[PDB]
């Protein structure tokens, strides 16, 4: 069969890209379609600011999504397009999957490194305002519900992805209650399966541990307290913003998948961003839509490139236009 | 002459303690102790304890301290004796020195570079009301006296220390409120010193960057939204809770610690933990003291006897007990007078 899928493309560097995977897919000739809906900040009728929708009929048509970075304002506009998105979906795990590049090197070597961080809770959805003049008040709350989804979602990802260990992230120190429930949740169902082994390590201890050394760790589980400064460290590691994917895996296998890297206006228009992101990031929609042997040869083709050298785009180290990076990749499949 | 309050606290923190002040035995620096022995684990702790603190803060203004573990069994730490104490002394502006030391090899080397965070409040206003059957509530608090506090230290410092850029490392995009203040007030005081460049970094993308390529940094000024954290992954640069130094200042003191002080920070037992996170904040202690001399000898020495790698902890690569790194350290001071 054909399948179709939404596509957003994004703000910034969303075209450059998302053009870019899109035509890796099309080299590839890969069984997919691709609904393209803009969806932009557009405002509610009772203030609640809802979705184009465009998008949010669309996105329901196909339960699944590849989707650029969507550009927040620094203070002054919508609470942020990305974060809604999440929510009016119930995409509520963000997989961070972190391994190496083989043929390009970093100062660390052999990362295979996972954040199963929640995406529904937290700092992500609250009310933050003006309590008095100068003086701001934020209102971040964390459930005992969702910390169990996303404890259940970490042993499962474990699980099928074949794990060692699974180790939860908290700062149970210093917030008591909000992360002392977490563990809870996440002891009972770790006690579920002693097919997974189990630790707790608190979120400055690893950070410090991490850039140490990433073989201490395998699947990582966090509450959405701290947002994410794990899993754009971990990104550190690999190579760039540029070569990293990520998930917001959901339930009933509806997902959106897009990438760390985000608006990226230094090099907007500029034609030197990395495709190596949007595309790993749809490598992991065809592995999570069951089409893996499109997904093995677009994957490991662009593996092979990096390794050659002669193409790897400008953060990467080599002057290489985002257009002949995404042709040697593409010619690359074609036999 | 010089008196200091000396806070051992507990953990190996008391050995430590120890190490620095035979070194300042060893170099004859005219600074004399007194130790509060206060600590909640061991149960020497009460209220009336760190107000004979701060009795002793008001003479010295001047204090070198430990880490006092928090019983995390039955309180938490925003209540631990180690918030009670950093409370009553107004501290704010945590300073962390991350710079990798000649001869200790890491990923990150040859790096300078300095991590100024709000200490006041952040992650530590959390306050936390039950609201449902299992609605976690968690509300915090950012103020723009507590925010042009923390940006004018952070000048300050950059213009007292030599050093040209800072950075404001901030979540507007999300935070539009809380950080759109702070940003507000770092970009006002941020005219005022104009011989330093000043520029804004989202604080997720600035973890990535910190561990690609440290080297593009030199002042990071931020709130203390999410924790310590940044301050503990910096420190990884440059080998450790065992070698990166800490100061915490207030408008009228200055508590000298270490940068990284996770829970178990050093979880070693007898012996065998490294001192030269405690030495270089002595001699930066000796430094404030303006007694550049000492302050001088210390850091110089405890700098080469870790170039020369004769001796070496456990963390460090090396098989030497403390007693026996911080006696080679002893024998390169009394050297060094003549
Ligand atoms: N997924 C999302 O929804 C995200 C949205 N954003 C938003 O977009 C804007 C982005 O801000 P920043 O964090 O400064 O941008 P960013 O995180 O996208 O960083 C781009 C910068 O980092 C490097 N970079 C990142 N990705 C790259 C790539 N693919 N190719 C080449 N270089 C790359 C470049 O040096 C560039 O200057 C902000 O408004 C932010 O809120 C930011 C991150 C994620």
């Given at each position: 069969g054909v399948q179709t899928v939404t596509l957003i493309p994004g703000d910034g560097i969303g075209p450059e890209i998302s053009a870019a995977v899109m035509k890796i897919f099309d080299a590839a000739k890969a069984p997919i379609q691709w609904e393209e809906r803009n969806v932009t900040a557009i405002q509610g009728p009772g203030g609640k600011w809802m979705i184009p929708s465009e998008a949010k009929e669309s996105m329901d048509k196909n339960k699944m999504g590849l989707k650029g970075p969507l550009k927040t304002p620094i203070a002054a506009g919508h609470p942020s397009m990305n974060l809604l998105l999440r929510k009016t979906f119930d995409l509520y795990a963000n997989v961070r999957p972190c391994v190496s590049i083989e043929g390009y090197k970093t100062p660390y070597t052999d990362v295979n490194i996972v954040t199963i961080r929640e995406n529904t809770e937290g700092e992500y959805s609250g009310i933050e305002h003006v309590?008095?003049?100068?003086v701001v008040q934020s209102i971040k709350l964390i459930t005992e519900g969702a910390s169990k989804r996303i404890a259940e979602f970490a042993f499962e990802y474990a699980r099928n992805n074949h794990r060692s260990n699974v180790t939860a992230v908290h700062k149970a120190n210093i917030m008591r209650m909000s992360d002392g429930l977490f563990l809870q949740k996440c002891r009972e169902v770790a006690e579920s399966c002693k097919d997974i082994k189990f630790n707790e390590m608190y979120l400055d201890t690893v950070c410090l541990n991490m850039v140490q050394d990433?073989?201490?760790?395998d699947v990582l589980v966090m509450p959405?307290?701290?947002?994410d400064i794990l899993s754009d460290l971990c990104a550190g590691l690999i190579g760039?913003?540029?070569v990293t994917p990520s998930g917001n895996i959901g339930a009933n296998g509806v997902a959106i998948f897009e990438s760390?890297?985000?608006?990226?206006?230094?090099?907007?228009?500029?034609?030197?961003?990395?495709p190596t992101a949007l595309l790993l990031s749809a490598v992991m929609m065809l592995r999570h839509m069951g089409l893996f042997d499109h997904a093995a040869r677009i994957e490991a083709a662009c593996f092979a490139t990096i390794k050659d050298?002669?193409?790897?785009?400008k953060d990467l180290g080599?002057?290489?236009?985002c257009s002949d990076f995404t042709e040697e990749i593409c010619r690359r499949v074609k036999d | 002459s010089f008196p200091v309050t000396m806070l051992p606290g507990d953990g190996v923190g008391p050995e430590l303690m120890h190490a620095v002040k035979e070194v300042f035995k060893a170099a004859a620096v005219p600074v004399e102790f007194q130790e509060h022995?206060?600590?909640?684990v061991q149960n020497m702790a009460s209220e009336e304890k760190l107000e004979q603190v701060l009795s002793s803060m008001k003479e010295n203004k001047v204090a070198i301290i430990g880490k006092i573990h928090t019983?995390?069994?039955?309180?938490g730490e925003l209540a631990s004796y180690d918030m009670r104490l950093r409370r009553k002394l107004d501290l704010f502006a945590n300073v962390v020195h991350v710079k990798s030391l000649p001869?200790?090899?890491?990923?990150?080397?040859?790096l300078d570079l300095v991590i100024i965070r709000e200490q006041t409040?952040?992650?530590?206003?959390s306050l936390e009301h039950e609201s449902a059957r299992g609605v976690i509530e968690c509300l915090k608090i950012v103020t723009r006296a507590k925010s042009q506090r923390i940006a004018k230290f952070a000048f300050d410092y950059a213009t007292k220390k030599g050093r040209g850029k800072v950075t404001a490392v901030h979540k507007?995009?999300?935070?539009k409120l809380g950080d759109g203040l702070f940003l507000q007030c770092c970009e006002e005081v941020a005219?005022?010193?104009?011989?330093i460049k000043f520029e804004t970094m989202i604080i997720d993308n600035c973890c990535m960057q910190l561990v690609q390529?440290?080297?593009?940094?030199?002042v990071l000024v931020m709130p203390?939204?999410?924790?310590?954290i940044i301050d503990n992954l910096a420190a990884g640069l440059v080998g450790g809770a065992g070698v990166v130094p800490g100061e915490s200042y207030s408008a009228e003191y200055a508590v000298f610690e270490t940068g990284a002080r996770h829970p178990f920070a050093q979880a070693v037992?007898?012996?065998?933990?490294?001192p030269t996170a405690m030495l270089l904040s002595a001699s930066n202690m000796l430094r404030h003291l303006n007694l550049e001399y000492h302050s001088s000898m210390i850091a110089d020495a405890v700098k080469k006897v870790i170039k020369v790698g004769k001796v070496r902890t456990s963390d460090m690569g090396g098989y030497a007990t403390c007693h026996d790194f911080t006696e080679e350290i002893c024998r390169r001071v009394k050297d060094l007078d003549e």
């Open positions: 309590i008095v003049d100068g990433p073989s201490q760790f959405n307290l701290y947002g760039g913003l540029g760390v890297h985000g608006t990226a206006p230094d090099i907007a228009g500029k034609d030197m961003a990395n050298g002669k193409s790897l785009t080599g002057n290489a236009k | 022995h206060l600590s909640e019983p995390m069994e039955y309180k001869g200790y090899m890491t990923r990150h080397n040859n409040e952040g992650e530590y206003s507007a995009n999300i935070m005219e005022l010193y104009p011989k390529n440290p080297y593009q940094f030199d203390n939204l999410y924790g310590n037992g007898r012996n065998i933990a490294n």
